[PDB]
Design an enzyme around this catalytic site. Sequence first.
Site, PDB file in Angstrom:
ATOM      1  N   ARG A   8      -0.701  64.711  46.033  1.00 33.31           N
ATOM      2  CA  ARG A   8      -1.577  65.858  46.030  1.00 33.31           C
ATOM      3  C   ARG A   8      -1.139  66.714  44.876  1.00 33.31           C
ATOM      4  O   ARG A   8       0.051  66.894  44.634  1.00 33.31           O
ATOM      5  CB  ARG A   8      -1.472  66.617  47.347  1.00 33.31           C
ATOM      6  N   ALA A  38      -2.215  70.279  42.262  1.00 35.28           N
ATOM      7  CA  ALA A  38      -2.719  71.623  42.372  1.00 35.28           C
ATOM      8  C   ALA A  38      -4.232  71.663  42.120  1.00 35.28           C
ATOM      9  O   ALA A  38      -4.932  72.539  42.640  1.00 35.28           O
ATOM     10  CB  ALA A  38      -1.978  72.523  41.377  1.00 35.28           C
ATOM     11  N   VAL A  51      -4.030  62.276  44.000  1.00 32.88           N
ATOM     12  CA  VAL A  51      -3.787  61.007  43.351  1.00 32.88           C
ATOM     13  C   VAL A  51      -4.121  59.996  44.448  1.00 32.88           C
ATOM     14  O   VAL A  51      -3.490  59.980  45.507  1.00 32.88           O
ATOM     15  CB  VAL A  51      -2.335  60.864  42.890  1.00 32.88           C
ATOM     16  N   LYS A  70      -5.593  59.686  39.392  1.00 35.12           N
ATOM     17  CA  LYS A  70      -5.487  61.116  39.555  1.00 35.12           C
ATOM     18  C   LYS A  70      -6.830  61.816  39.272  1.00 35.12           C
ATOM     19  O   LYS A  70      -7.536  61.474  38.314  1.00 35.12           O
ATOM     20  CB  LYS A  70      -4.430  61.681  38.605  1.00 35.12           C
ATOM     21  N   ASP A  91      10.498  69.800  33.540  1.00 33.86           N
ATOM     22  CA  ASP A  91      10.150  69.695  34.961  1.00 33.86           C
ATOM     23  C   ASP A  91      10.770  68.419  35.514  1.00 33.86           C
ATOM     24  O   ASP A  91      10.168  67.669  36.291  1.00 33.86           O
ATOM     25  CB  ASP A  91       8.632  69.707  35.164  1.00 33.86           C
ATOM     26  N   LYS A  94      12.614  66.449  37.900  1.00 29.96           N
ATOM     27  CA  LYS A  94      12.940  66.583  39.309  1.00 29.96           C
ATOM     28  C   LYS A  94      12.574  65.313  40.032  1.00 29.96           C
ATOM     29  O   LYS A  94      11.739  64.549  39.583  1.00 29.96           O
ATOM     30  CB  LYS A  94      12.188  67.765  39.930  1.00 29.96           C
ATOM     31  N   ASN A 139       8.895  63.898  40.270  1.00 28.64           N
ATOM     32  CA  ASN A 139       8.243  63.314  39.121  1.00 28.64           C
ATOM     33  C   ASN A 139       8.855  61.991  38.737  1.00 28.64           C
ATOM     34  O   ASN A 139       8.470  61.428  37.723  1.00 28.64           O
ATOM     35  CB  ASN A 139       8.314  64.267  37.920  1.00 28.64           C
TER      36      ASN A 139
HETATM   37  O1  LIG Z   1       3.286  60.547  43.227  1.00 29.17           O
HETATM   38  S1  LIG Z   1       2.108  60.961  42.527  1.00 29.17           S
HETATM   39  O2  LIG Z   1       0.984  61.005  43.389  1.00 29.17           O
HETATM   40  C1  LIG Z   1       1.773  59.869  41.185  1.00 29.17           C
HETATM   41  C2  LIG Z   1       1.548  60.408  39.895  1.00 29.17           C
HETATM   42  C3  LIG Z   1       1.286  59.602  38.750  1.00 29.17           C
HETATM   43  C4  LIG Z   1       1.270  58.192  38.825  1.00 29.17           C
HETATM   44  C5  LIG Z   1       1.495  57.607  40.089  1.00 29.17           C
HETATM   45  C6  LIG Z   1       1.475  56.206  40.215  1.00 29.17           C
HETATM   46  N1  LIG Z   1       1.728  55.612  41.423  1.00 29.17           N
HETATM   47  C7  LIG Z   1       1.947  56.349  42.567  1.00 29.17           C
HETATM   48  C8  LIG Z   1       1.996  57.773  42.517  1.00 29.17           C
HETATM   49  C9  LIG Z   1       1.774  58.435  41.301  1.00 29.17           C
HETATM   50  N2  LIG Z   1       2.457  62.338  41.798  1.00 29.17           N
HETATM   51  C10 LIG Z   1       1.443  63.438  41.673  1.00 29.17           C
HETATM   52  C11 LIG Z   1       1.687  64.686  42.550  1.00 29.17           C
HETATM   53  C12 LIG Z   1       3.089  65.299  42.497  1.00 29.17           C
HETATM   54  N3  LIG Z   1       3.780  65.083  41.205  1.00 29.17           N
HETATM   55  C13 LIG Z   1       4.327  63.795  40.688  1.00 29.17           C
HETATM   56  C14 LIG Z   1       3.841  62.451  41.264  1.00 29.17           C
END
Ligand SMILES: O=S(=O)(c1cccc2cnccc12)N1CCCNCC1
Lengths: 386, 386
Positions: free
Chosen positions: A74, A76, A80, A95, A188, A190, A193
């Site tokens: 999720r 802001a 995703v 996303k 950022d 953490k 990410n």
């Molecule tokens: O885990 S995610 O949904 C995600 C982001 C980008 C690529 C991704 C690929 N696979 C799973 C989850 C992924 N994501 C977004 C919300 C919070 N911040 C960082 C990670």
Amino acid sequence: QRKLEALIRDPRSPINVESLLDGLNSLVLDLDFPALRKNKNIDNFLNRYEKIVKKIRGLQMKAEDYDVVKVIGRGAFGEVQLVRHKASQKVYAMKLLSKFEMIKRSDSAFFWEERDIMAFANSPWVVQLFCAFQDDKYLYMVMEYMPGGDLVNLMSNYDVPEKWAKFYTAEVVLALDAIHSMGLIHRDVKPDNMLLDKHGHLKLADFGTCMKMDETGMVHCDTAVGTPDYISPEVLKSQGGDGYYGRECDWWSVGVFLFEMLVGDTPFYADSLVGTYSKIMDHKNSLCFPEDAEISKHAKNLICAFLTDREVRLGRNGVEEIKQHPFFKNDQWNWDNIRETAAPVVPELSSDIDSSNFDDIEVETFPIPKAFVGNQLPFIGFTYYR
Amino acid sequence: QRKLEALIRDPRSPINVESLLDGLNSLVLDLDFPALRKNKNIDNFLNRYEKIVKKIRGLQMKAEDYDVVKVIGRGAFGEVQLVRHKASQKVYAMKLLSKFEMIKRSDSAFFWEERDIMAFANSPWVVQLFCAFQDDKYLYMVMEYMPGGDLVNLMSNYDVPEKWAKFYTAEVVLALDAIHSMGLIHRDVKPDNMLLDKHGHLKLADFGTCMKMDETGMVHCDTAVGTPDYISPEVLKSQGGDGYYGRECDWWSVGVFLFEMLVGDTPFYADSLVGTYSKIMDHKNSLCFPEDAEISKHAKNLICAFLTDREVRLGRNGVEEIKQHPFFKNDQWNWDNIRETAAPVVPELSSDIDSSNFDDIEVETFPIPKAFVGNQLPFIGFTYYR
Ligand SMILES: O=S(=O)(c1cccc2cnccc12)N1CCCNCC1
Ligand SMILES: O=S(=O)(c1cccc2cnccc12)N1CCCNCC1
């Protein structure tokens, strides 16, 4: 008239084909309204091009081209989704960014850096962008799915031994060095990410706060960014005016990460956000290790070397001094081959849509405009296909 | 995503490269103003693209790329200048259309047909368009220069014998047949639109009133067009509602032309315009030949066969009956080779800028806009380069 055959075909350029089409499609969208059509300059143009544009819009990738298996993240401005492209049957993380939420919040230009990094980084450390498209309501980014889940999830399911903590920290340092060498500082860093792929290896999956470095490798910025637990003291203080700092702010976050992974809590934890900012400003006194926490000499040493003021922080003379720290000494991998050695936690998946490593998760049109307001303008140039 | 590599490169398509650039350039022009920039969607976009667009505008053909040798024609929306391209040193006729005059007069879409015919006709009977460009103020059309001058000038400098009148009339019939076979009816056939080239052969140089034919070769139109002396009765009557007619209206004008060339005056001449309309409506009585005018049997016959109501007019069963009329019988040329036989009046030029066959001839910005009005929109797609 010679260079244009180049520009138009160069994917990096702002005026390539896909961008020229975005413009002509955003223009038609933003002009085709009742009131606006009373003007004739507008109504004429909308006549000549409206038909052909609606046909071209038919050949555009669409959200309907995908099945939404389920929400895995999720944001802001959207979510995703884990999706399967219907024709190919291939799975991806997609996303969504709401155009209305970005416009309403007046934050409609923060995604360019991410779109560029994920599309052109071409690095095993960076989640890859296969394609970006848009419709009148949303922005879409089709990325490679990371079934391993993030590190916040790995830290809460295992008690992490140092052997693992070296592995992950080493991959995090390598991933950030890759970003820095592209001319950017992350800001950022953490666990949220950091994602793990099918093999259990790491990749950075978010670049919403990245910034292009100087000719000296520094940035001037007056806004504190990043999650409270991980904001470095120089980034926090820059909120008070005239911040000038480099990549050392990412190295600080690595220290917070390593601490959290070995101690089980973030070093500057507090019940309020303001409580945490205060600890950070007072890190010289606030940092302390728990009595019963068992941490090696070298591990504690590395954590303390990162968690200090920039001027004496490990990495102030380059990443080389971070890589040679004794904490990283080991028999399984070296800095050149870590990504092709056995990961600590190899995912055990039962299918191409297994999202067990992701916790579960639980509609506002624009007011038809009176006169031209141009709400599709900020997203001209977003479209991208490999 | 396959067909686009086609569309973008197809010069006929409305969304080719040059048109996509026109859009993106017209958008920036129409949005970059003081008041408009208070809106942020606009100001943001104008930031990302304004720099790159101004650079691309540098690679655009410009009026300054040409020396204005002198004005040789005057239009309702601008002039036709004899010019020399500075770098190549080649001469051309360049027509200018004022964007402000077309917008103010609400007549900003009459040029498409002409631009298309001169650019794509690829016919020895049609003046050729080398390239079309634009700047914020004007539309430009670079065409091949016709040093021979028009036929209004040839008719006032020579007493035209039938031998010549056959030649010119035959080339006029061939030029119109070429236009008809492209799916268009001219509707403004007159000596002013007929030019003679370097060799003395004819070409049509104006298509401002052309119209695409039906599937039956006809058009529905309720507006009388063309110069009064040459308007046919069916086009004149269509002004009263429900006009439905074909190419026969061009054949009528040929009759007026042939009469004027052999008699020295137009057949329906009157001191007022309304006087002329009246003669035309009453052509059965108003047409008459001067007592002292010496015209051959066949010549007078052809003139009368064209100058009648459509239902019995020569050409009602196809152009073949016009070509076999006895007036065209001769020993110098046939319908297949007329354009490669000696012209009656071979121009005698002293240089590449000799404009002796052309009579001599003797600045209003748009009010900075409050909100978006889109004054560059009607001209998106005008740009064209061979
Ligand atoms: O885990 S995610 O949904 C995600 C982001 C980008 C690529 C991704 C690929 N696979 C799973 C989850 C992924 N994501 C977004 C919300 C919070 N911040 C960082 C990670
Ligand atoms: O003679 S023009 O200047 C002219 C037009 C187009 C191409 C030309 C090429 N050479 C000379 C004159 C030309 N012209 C415009 C105004 C009146 N209508 C028809 C002709």
